[PDB]
From Swiss-Prot, chains A, B:
It is found in: Plastid, Chloroplast. This is DNA endonuclease I-CreI. It comes from Chlamydomonas reinhardtii. Mg(2+) 1 binds at residues 18-19. Its EC number is 3.1.-.-. Changing residue 97 to R: Strongly reduced affinity for DNA. No effect on catalytic activity. One of its GO terms (biological process) is intron homing. One of its GO terms (molecular function) is identical protein binding. Its main location: plastid. Residues 25-37, 43-46, 67-69, 137-142 are annotated as: Interaction with DNA. The keyword Thylakoid does not apply. The keyword Protease does not apply.
Length: 153, 153
């Protein structure tokens, strides 16, 4: 229920439209009722020499974490409830990635019913794919890609 | 010159910090007094399917142009006077690329004197290099790189 400052949201939306990522993924996981688990991730990446900017985002957003990946680092926010509150506030200012944000919110509002319904879940799976297409990523996998995801998990 | 709206500047500054380019170059050119010419470029790049965002920037900034490269296109602003007026207004909101914008301004304000003084021009050459380094680009060239730049001209 953190309320963010509008000038911050305006600058961060332009930053996100230029280089941030709003991503959803469905990965195989035998512990889940439908054998797959959803992950939702707002991500900003910088070279490690500007990791201060990512640690600053954690201070300013109040949630999320920074992870190192060698010569780059990311700010990651993947907790559902703070992610919903953050993207609800950022969305009105996004111009290139607003549809990704809208779909993540739609997915999150559907998760209680996706826990029990196969139909509700499979429909989340279609919105996951719509996000990937908006992100210019692959939305369809070959048989080898599917089995390899299973093996990787 | 034109006065830009502040919420547009905040959003565009975050967009520039995320993925925009403030670049300066010195290239060999026989017709110039010191045998080299300066180019100053503010550049935003998008995939061609989102070229509309770049053509929109031309409408909103009031100057600059869009060029197609392959699967990508750029908005380019390289005219001195409008570039100075635009970066003067955007600079207070930049958080990662502010030093590049300030050096481009300092270069532009030095251009009348750099026209006649070798020392003024060579000093602009040092600011060009400082921008390159801030851009994580190389600031020193090998002999083959220098001669090739001559040949390319």
């Amino acid at each position: 229920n953190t309320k963010y400052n509008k000038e911050f949201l305006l600058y961060l939306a332009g930053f996100v439209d230029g280089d941030g990522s709003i991503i959803a993924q469905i990965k195989p996981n035998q512990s889940y009722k439908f054998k797959h688990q959803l992950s939702l991730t707002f991500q900003v990446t910088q070279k490690t020499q500007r990791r201060w900017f990512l640690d600053k985002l954690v201070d300013e957003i109040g949630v999320g974490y920074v992870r190192d990946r060698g010569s780059v680092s990311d700010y990651i926010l993947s907790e559902i409830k703070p992610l919903h509150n953050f993207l609800t506030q950022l969305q009105p200012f996004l111009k290139l990635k607003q549809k990704q944000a809208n779909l993540v919110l739609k997915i999150i509002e559907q998760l209680p019913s996706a826990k029990e319904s196969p139909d509700k879940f499979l429909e989340v799976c279609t919105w996951v794919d719509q996000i990937a297409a908006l992100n210019d990523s692959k939305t369809r996998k070959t048989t080898s890609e599917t089995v390899r995801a299973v093996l990787d998990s």
